[PDB]
């Protein structure tokens, strides 16, 4: 039985001081006003999952990182708030951090920003921006080994400019923007494992999303106990 | 179920600051270049165990300390490196630290240096010397209550002189050198519990080594999980 | 008979202080833990040479620099480690530094990074990165007048980002990245002397590699004496 | 052809600064008033050699150090001065430093002080004492890995007390005093290689001295060229 504090050690290469600072932030970061709740039950965001907003690839990248996929077009800003969408990432992260190999090799996330609207940007306030930067850098026990943005419209750079100043130099080096002709570049970073929609060979995004939705629903009892352990 | 961090508390008389510093070193000490691996499976050093290099007494000393015995003559430096020999002590220590009474009363080690050669000393580099001093003082959650050297040849003092400068005043007070006429002195420190070869009454070293070898092999599954919890 | 210390003078335009600092680093740089051995015998890396990984052009560039060619596709990371590959450059450098005209006009290296894999990047640790930067700047008596990277995949920039912070401003100005359409740009820097595979007119890479392999094997006695003069 | 400055590098583990300081002292140390001459021709001390004062063992110690033997009883202070006796060590040192394996593994010297008289001590002035300490520590490119004194009379400690304050902590750790029952202790440091007179099995001191005397006489042309290269 790995202690709860072991994931923080692995996240900081067993540097006790650094892991301590990470744990401190992990308990404080969401309490930043206006706070996001510690509620991690999928009932409030099951609609997002069924809309096909989010999924996790079955296979890891060539360095062992778990690969996450987000499709912004499947987020209706009139139905779900940024906090709801944020909650989806929290739920997923709390689940995949259980894997030791994820703890060691980190994660990489792919954001399909095709269909990004001003209504989306309206949700991203400075306070939200700060929280995004927090979990990317030093507030959650997951190594962010790479962030890949594809199909980014020109209007998105305003949003990213809100997040940028709160980002460390390390994470900034790991943020990639591919544009519309992403497939060649994206395939080089993720051989053999991408879905059909992004240059892959086997699985479709619909299947990948449905699989991860089932896993989240399946884990709703574990997600409840996590919620009660941070309040 | 005692938490993993309780053995560090007991090792420092429940001084939270001091136990914290010990845990920090416990995760860092082996990473000192050139590093020793976190691998604790007995497969790589089963030869040493079967050669009769190492054993643990069945009974404790009058103060409750576990008593460890090392015979340097049973270490062939042409077959096993200093790192392999070091690994044997790591494996044994990770096992006996599970006993609460060992956590409270510490350990005492007896090194039979009869048969110490220059080929042995060749293995003990300055880096190795530093690591020896580290686990003796502040890098492993075991109180070193005594170190007893017997049958030490005159050429050994060069080796000890490498270790000495990195030793604290407390541990230095606890290092004894008996020479060839050790039996009278050694019996006073360890009544009733020594093997036949060292003035004892009952058990032989061959039996003691065979018993501890079986226990190590028996614990190979626990030793694997420890290895995976420090990387 | 040119003294051994003359190549360090020529490398620093007969600035005695600067040449002294270079000689100091030349003796210390490989001892950085984890150290690379001073062994320069081609027996350990003959496989790399026969695989066509490395060769030296017969003719010099328009400024008199010796031109070196490396093909990363001919390096199998499952057979040869980064240290083995590093050793190949050490061996070549120790040979060409014997030429006075190379001492005066320096060298230029061309790295064909076509076929660069994550398995290659796995070998390039931070410690290795530091050593690469060391021999590029101030640890070997060869003026690096230019480094040319061709056919670089997008995933390589992560590796280069490890090396970059340890690079001086001078050397950084001398690192070129051409991409896939390199031929026009590469021909302007190296007229008349390139192999067929890179826009040249006469010789093939296979011939160039075979010629330099023979020369290395031919010089194995000189390479042994160098090894014994740095330990 | 190893440069003359390579022996200073090997003597200081290729630390360029430290080797530089050693070379500086090597040229200055004998010039300390009252100076000893740079003359290294055996003609002035052939009498000492034929008297059986000095010899070098054919075999090295278990660590590769050259082993030197001095017999103070064969020094007649009424015939040869301390400077003459000092010259013998200079001559021997300049010869054995030519061996690369001696440069790497250093030397160990055995002084048989049986027959030490006050007439001997009369020769050892404070200035002489300082010079003895100089060549032991930082004025000659030979690592002193050990000094062994045997058969030392009680009156010798006055002489050693003159040398002691000018000795570094490192060298002081390497000075052994065995007394009259030296054989057991001396054999442990030098197995298989000692002469008959000191617990050995094969060769006698008379043979060892005669062999080294021939070698010195044989090298008189090399010793002349060394003398002319330090003035
Ligand atoms: C532990 C962890 C969390 C919790 C996490 C992410 C990652 C990589 C993590 O490791 C990435 C996404 C994020 C920050 C949730 C983002 C919430 C907003 C609403 C997403 C849509 C708008 C973003 C402007 C789109 C770009 C996001 C990238 C700049 C990361 O939640
Ligand atoms: C937690 C712990 C470890 C890990 C440990 C020891 C003790 C008492 C511990 O509590 C004692 C032995 C040691 C340091 C391994 C020593 C490895 C070398 C190769 C032993 C042979 C050579 C030594 C020069 C012999 C003398 C050793 C004493 C000076 C300790 O490993
Ligand atoms: C004196 C000298 C040495 C010794 C040398 C080089 C040069 C130009 C020298 O002048 C260039 C190559 C290098 C640094 C060996 C590199 C070893 C690694 C394994 C090469 C493959 C991976 C590299 C990441 C590829 C890019 C290299 C460039 C950034 C230089 O060895
Ligand atoms: C490079 C080198 C030299 C040059 C050298 C020695 C050694 C080990 C060297 O490595 C040892 C002997 C010495 C210092 C010459 C000594 C001269 C006197 C006259 C010897 C007789 C009286 C001594 C009081 C006897 C004890 C000597 C030990 C304390 C070294 O010359
Ligand atoms: Cl909320
Ligand atoms: Cl990219
Ligand atoms: Cl190892
Ligand atoms: Cl005692
Ligand atoms: Cl190596
Ligand atoms: Cl260019
Ligand atoms: Cl004189
Ligand atoms: Cl002794």
Residue numbers in the entry:
A (entry chain A), B (entry chain A), C (entry chain A), D (entry chain A): 48 to 278
Question: What did the published study say regarding this structure?
Answer:
The crystal structures were solved by molecular replacement method using the atomic model of monomeric α-TTP (PDB code 1OIP39) and refined at 2.40 Å resolution (reduced form; Rwork:Rfree 18.2%:21.5%) and at 2.42 Å resolution (oxidized form; Rwork:Rfree 19.1%:21.2%) respectively. In both cases, the asymmetric unit consists of a single α-TTP molecule (residues 48–278) with one α-Tol ligand bound to it. The oxidised form of α-TTPS presents here one disulphide bridge crosslinking C80 of two α-TTP units through the rhombohedral channel. Oxidation is accompanied by local unwinding of the helical segment (aa’s 65–79). It also induces structuring of the neighbouring C-terminus (aa’s 275–278) into a regular α-helical motif. We notice that folding stabilisation of the C-terminal amino acid residues accompanies the maturation of α-TTPS. In the oxidised α-TTPS, it is involved in a strong H-bond and salt-bridge network of interactions with the partner protein.
Retention of α-Tol in animals requires α-tocopherol transfer protein (α-TTP) in the liver, a cytosolic transporter of 32 kDa weight. α-TTP belongs to the Sec-14 like family, a protein group involved in secretion and lipid transfer. α-TTP recognises and selectively extracts α-Tol from the endosomal fraction of the hepatocytes allowing for its transfer into the inner leaflet of the plasma membrane and eventually across the plasma membrane into the blood-stream. Here we show that, upon binding to α-Tol, α-TTP is formed acquiring tendency to aggregation into high molecular weight oligomers. X-ray diffraction reveals a spheroidal nanoparticle formed by 24 α-TTP protomers of ≈17 nm diameter.
